[PDB]
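Hi,

I'm pasting everything inline rather than attaching a file, because the server keeps stripping attachments. The sequence lines come first, and each chain or strand is labelled.
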Amino acid sequence: IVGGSNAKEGAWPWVVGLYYGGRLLCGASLVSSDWLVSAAACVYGRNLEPSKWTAILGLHMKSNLTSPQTVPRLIDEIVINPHYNRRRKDNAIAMMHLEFKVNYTDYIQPICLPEENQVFPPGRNCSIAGWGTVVYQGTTANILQEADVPLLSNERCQQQMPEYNITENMICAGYEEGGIDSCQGDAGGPLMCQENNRWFLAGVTSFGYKCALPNRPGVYARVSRFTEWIQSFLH
Amino acid sequence: EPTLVPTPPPELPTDCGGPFELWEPNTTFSSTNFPNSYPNLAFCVWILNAQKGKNIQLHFQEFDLENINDVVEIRDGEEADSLLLAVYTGPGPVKDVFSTTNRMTVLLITADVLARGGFKANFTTGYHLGIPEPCKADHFQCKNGECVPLVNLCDGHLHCEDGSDEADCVRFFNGTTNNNGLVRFRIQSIWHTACAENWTTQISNDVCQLLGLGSGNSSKPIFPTDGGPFVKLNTAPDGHLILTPSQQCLQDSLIRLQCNHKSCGKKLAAQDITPK
Ligand SMILES: *[C@@H]1O[C@H](CO)[C@@H](O[C@@H]2O[C@H](CO)[C@@H](O[C@@H]3O[C@H](CO)[C@@H](O)[C@H](O[C@H]4O[C@H](CO)[C@@H](O)[C@H](O)[C@@H]4O)[C@@H]3O)[C@H](O)[C@H]2NC(C)=O)[C@H](O)[C@H]1NC(C)=O
Ligand SMILES: *[C@@H]1O[C@H](CO)[C@@H](O[C@@H]2O[C@H](CO)[C@@H](O[C@@H]3O[C@H](CO)[C@@H](O)[C@H](O[C@H]4O[C@H](CO)[C@@H](O)[C@H](O)[C@@H]4O)[C@@H]3O)[C@H](O)[C@H]2NC(C)=O)[C@H](O)[C@H]1NC(C)=O
Ligand SMILES: *[C@@H]1O[C@H](CO)[C@@H](O[C@@H]2O[C@H](CO)[C@@H](O[C@@H]3O[C@H](CO[C@H]4O[C@H](CO)[C@@H](O)[C@H](O)[C@@H]4O)[C@@H](O)[C@H](O)[C@@H]3O)[C@H](O)[C@H]2NC(C)=O)[C@H](O)[C@H]1NC(C)=O
Ligand SMILES: *[C@@H]1O[C@H](CO)[C@@H](O[C@@H]2O[C@H](CO)[C@@H](O[C@@H]3O[C@H](CO[C@H]4O[C@H](CO)[C@@H](O)[C@H](O)[C@@H]4O)[C@@H](O)[C@H](O)[C@@H]3O)[C@H](O)[C@H]2NC(C)=O)[C@H](O)[C@H]1NC(C)=O
Ligand SMILES: *[C@@H]1O[C@H](CO)[C@@H](O[C@@H]2O[C@H](CO)[C@@H](O[C@@H]3O[C@H](CO)[C@@H](O)[C@H](O)[C@@H]3O)[C@H](O)[C@H]2NC(C)=O)[C@H](O)[C@H]1NC(C)=O
Ligand SMILES: *[C@@H]1O[C@H](CO)[C@@H](O[C@@H]2O[C@H](CO)[C@@H](O[C@@H]3O[C@H](CO)[C@@H](O)[C@H](O)[C@@H]3O)[C@H](O)[C@H]2NC(C)=O)[C@H](O)[C@H]1NC(C)=O
Ligand SMILES: *[C@@H]1O[C@H](CO)[C@@H](O[C@@H]2O[C@H](CO)[C@@H](O[C@@H]3O[C@H](CO)[C@@H](O)[C@H](O)[C@@H]3O)[C@H](O)[C@H]2NC(C)=O)[C@H](O)[C@H]1NC(C)=O
Ligand SMILES: *[C@@H]1O[C@H](CO)[C@@H](O[C@@H]2O[C@H](CO)[C@@H](O[C@@H]3O[C@H](CO)[C@@H](O)[C@H](O)[C@@H]3O)[C@H](O)[C@H]2NC(C)=O)[C@H](O)[C@H]1NC(C)=O
Ligand SMILES: *[C@@H]1O[C@H](CO)[C@@H](O[C@@H]2O[C@H](CO)[C@@H](O[C@@H]3O[C@H](CO)[C@@H](O)[C@H](O)[C@@H]3O)[C@H](O)[C@H]2NC(C)=O)[C@H](O)[C@H]1NC(C)=O
Ligand SMILES: *[C@@H]1O[C@H](CO)[C@@H](O[C@@H]2O[C@H](CO[C@@H]3O[C@H](CO)[C@@H](O)[C@H](O)[C@@H]3O)[C@@H](O)[C@H](O)[C@H]2NC(C)=O)[C@H](O)[C@H]1NC(C)=O
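And the predicted assembly:
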């Protein structure tokens, strides 16, 4: 987001937007025909009114959605991960269900959930995207932006930010010299890394100390430890 | 010299709540002051104790707060781990909350403005309050508690009352990975193979579809390692599959399938080529 580059149409078909009251608030990703994944932090205290959430698929530009590529959708059921406390900011994953199935096309693709016994060593480049602000004091009203950030270990993250209970359920990423940090604005953006011509899901955007500050890596929720929970009701 | 006018500032550090632990004899309670308002920037925790093996049912007689800045959290743990259970906020009546443990935690979080009346609770204890009546006459136990002798277990219809019996009686015994394993089917109570003597590619594709996977990749048999109650599977004119029980048979062969992974998020978009 911050310091990134503008993306083209169809670059990331699995990135979808979520609206609430006519304003963009949080991001989401497509998992199956009628399921979505998003950070549980942004969807909190609003789970009693599912009808007020509007789902947009194939979102590329915020100018007008009259083009035959945006399919409006509504959320029928919202599921929040039981292991959440809003104190340690640990395990914030939420699941959203669409009212009707959406046919797969060229501009609509799902994400590939990681399997068990998969190890991603630090230092591998992974891509990020979102519609968040880029000036840290404004908003973004343009096409989707993309950027690439390295991977950092848990010990390095604890050493750089000794102010939170990092534990082993969190993923940290970001350059040591700063410059690019997509933890502001869009907190529902997915963390995507590829493996031999197939893009998987690596993490879910979470809280952060402050974007672009040196030695301030981001926070992302682990997905390999929640694959079974998602597949339980993936259907 | 003093810039601040001689008026009392808010000056409300910490929480300054109320009672923390209660028991059965006292049920109804209000947070701070139900008739008028509650203090801002407060965080009070109530612990509902109960006898071992008994559930707790909570009800609210009145519940009128603000918008969404203030929320109420109910947890069944607060010892080593807890679950969000149910969270209610905003004006309007709320439903009762059931807990599977013998200890319930209630939390209140408020902002610095927009004080409201508050809420009052209704403490009730019992046995299996959130669990429906167990099934009788050896009927099938469903998710919603409905009892039916035999209208389920992967029948060729949806006669079950719930209508959500989408589970399939197919699983990989032993195997080498998730996508590789011996195919077994359970007609009524016993899992067994499908007699791949007349196995074809269409049957493999149908089986892979039933397992939420791709198409038929490999269908090479090895030998009948298991001596289970073999039943016969054969093609049908329609889109279904017919499984004929043919137990007590010799000269058979098992099924070894490796269904390909489903198509997923590969960048199949016809991106233009930049002449640079
Ligand atoms: C997602 O994909 C699914 C399937 O992949 C798709 O379902 C299709 O919906 C269209 C709706 O327009 C179906 O087309 C109709 O089919 C019915 C079948 O009886 C016909 O009656 C319709 O009209 C015919 O008959 C009329 C009689 O007077 C004729 O006048 C007319 O000329 C037609 O011949 C019409 O053809 C289509 O059959 C299904 N697909 C399948 C495989 O059944 C769905 O629309 C897609 N989109 C969404 C949002 O789900
Ligand atoms: C899934 O995998 C399991 C294990 O991988 C498998 O169970 C195994 O079945 C085989 C036969 O199909 C068993 O092999 C026999 O086991 C007995 C009892 O353990 C042994 O006594 C046998 O040894 C014979 O040979 C010895 C040397 O000559 C003699 O001294 C002896 O008396 C016997 O004659 C033979 O090894 C094997 O033990 C089990 N394994 C376990 C852990 O039980 C199962 O069949 C597989 N299922 C499917 C559907 O593939
Ligand atoms: C929403 O945003 C979209 C961007 O993703 C817009 O799509 C494209 O918008 C451009 C705007 O310049 C269009 O380019 C023009 O297209 C017209 C053809 O449409 C008109 O054609 C005749 C005149 O020839 C007219 O009589 C018709 O009534 C049409 O109004 C060309 O004539 C122009 O020279 C120019 O090239 C793209 O065509 C358009 N593409 C698509 C696929 O829509 C979209 O327009 C935006 N929607 C709104 C309401 O603003
Ligand atoms: C909710 O129900 C509870 C019962 O399950 C109530 O707790 C009991 O309330 C009665 C009513 O006052 C108390 O009776 C008093 O007991 C004291 C003796 O306890 C004093 O000494 C001990 C130390 O030994 C000290 O810890 C206590 O704090 C007291 O200072 C008598 O002196 C009094 O005359 C009176 O009889 C019970 O003591 C009390 N139970 C316990 C275990 O303390 C509770 O009050 C109910 N909630 C409300 C808001 O009323
Ligand atoms: C992950 O992405 C980073 C992007 O930050 C990659 O870093 C890039 O690495 C290349 C190879 O060393 C750098 O190229 C350099 O170009 C200068 C030009 O004069 C040359 O003198 C150097 O010898 C070197 O070839 C590049 O500057 C650098 N940064 C970029 C592209 O922004 C990294 O290679 C990627 N892969 C990893 C970390 O495994
Ligand atoms: C992250 O979370 C972990 C686990 O919650 C924290 O580790 C815990 O830290 C406390 C210190 O406040 C440890 O208590 C101490 O244990 C030693 C054991 O010998 C004892 O001698 C001390 O008197 C004290 O009681 C605790 O053992 C330790 N582990 C657990 C499981 O609680 C950690 O502090 C948090 N923060 C960071 C930056 O890691
Ligand atoms: C995993 O990585 C390997 C890298 O070796 C990928 O293999 C490469 O796949 C592409 C197609 O996706 C091949 O391009 C095609 O090559 C043929 C000639 O073999 C040419 O006629 C076509 O027009 C097209 O350019 C590429 O050659 C191939 N690389 C090698 C060394 O064979 C593979 O696709 C990746 N994904 C997997 C295995 O799922
Ligand atoms: C919340 O607290 C109130 C305070 O007592 C509880 O009200 C009591 O509820 C029971 C069960 O509904 C009532 O007993 C029933 O009365 C009806 C007649 O209205 C009778 O037909 C039934 O056979 C049964 O005996 C009881 O009368 C009622 N108390 C009063 C004073 O009317 C309420 O149950 C609590 N809610 C929960 C969920 O615990
Ligand atoms: C069953 O699934 C496996 C997935 O591992 C399929 O393996 C893949 O097969 C294709 C086609 O043979 C391989 O493409 C390569 O194309 C180049 C083009 O010259 C050729 O030189 C290679 O020898 C190879 O054929 C692909 O690399 C391979 N994937 C892996 C990871 O090895 C297999 O094809 C599937 N079975 C059927 C019947 O499709
Ligand atoms: C599984 O595959 C085997 C192998 O093809 C099938 O066994 C063949 O069965 C046919 C059936 O014989 C019938 O004979 C009638 C006259 O008596 C005739 O009117 C009818 O059309 C049919 O031909 C037999 O001819 C073959 O000789 C059998 N093949 C072998 C190798 O024994 C078997 O039916 C298949 N089972 C299925 C599809 O469920």
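The pocket of ligand 8 is lined by residues B 59, 96, 122, 124 (CB under 6 Å).

If the labels don't parse on your end, tell me and I'll reformat.
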